[PDB]
């Protein structure tokens, strides 16, 4: 409800909206189980023909990356 800032551009608006959902995104990520979340993320992207092996295991502050559309089923 704060009209305290008005937006120069697409990215400024988009980020302002995005940062608002994080109170919900936290709650979903607290209780889902990350291995599913990542599995779905990699699946909606067509990447590397949808599933491929990983030689190396490397965790990339994946907590802030994950889309809500990935989080919901896992929860």
């Amino acid at each position: 409800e704060d009209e305290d800032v008005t937006f120069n551009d697409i990215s400024s608006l988009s980020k302002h909206v995005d940062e608002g959902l994080d109170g919900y995104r936290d709650y979903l990520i607290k209780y889902s189980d990350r291995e599913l979340v990542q599995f779905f993320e990699n699946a909606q992207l067509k990447r590397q023909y949808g599933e491929e092996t990983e030689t190396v295991k490397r965790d990339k502050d994946e907590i802030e990356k994950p889309s809500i559309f990935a989080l919901l089923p896992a929860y």
Binding site: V56, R58, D59, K60, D61
Partner: protein, 130 residues
């Protein structure tokens, strides 16, 4: 090169050795060349095709053999070194043999004078010049 003695001193040395060895009638002292020793060492490693590095010191030469050697290489090296040691002993030339894994475990890195190691995408280490 590394010994400075007179003939008299050498004779005295001879006689004292003869006193330590009551079964020997005399001890013959022979002067050998350091350059010869070092050269035969390096020639043997080339002849065996082993990869190596050489380091020089005021009183010694060190050959460092390190990495992921194959079992044939390890066999050859063990045989050669064992032969050399029995001829020249271990005082002047030393052979350092080290099996070890590939450097930095298969991380990627920037190896200049300002190098660094990637831990993961998004993560830099900057530990030392590489």
């Amino acid at each position: 090169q590394r010994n400075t003695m007179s003939k008299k001193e050498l004779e005295v040395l001879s006689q004292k050795l003869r006193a330590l060895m009551p079964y020997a009638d005399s001890v013959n002292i022979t002067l050998m060349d350091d350059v010869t020793a070092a050269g035969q060492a390096e020639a043997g490693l080339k002849q065996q095709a082993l990869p190596y590095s050489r380091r020089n010191h005021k009183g010694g030469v060190t050959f460092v053999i390190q990495g992921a050697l194959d079992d044939v290489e390890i066999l050859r090296a063990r045989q050669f070194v064992d032969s050399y040691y029995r001829t020249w002993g271990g005082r002047y030339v030393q052979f350092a043999i080290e099996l070890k894994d590939d450097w930095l475990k298969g991380r990627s890195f920037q190896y200049g004078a300002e190098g660094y190691i990637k831990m993961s995408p998004g993560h830099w280490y900057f530990p030392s010049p590489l």
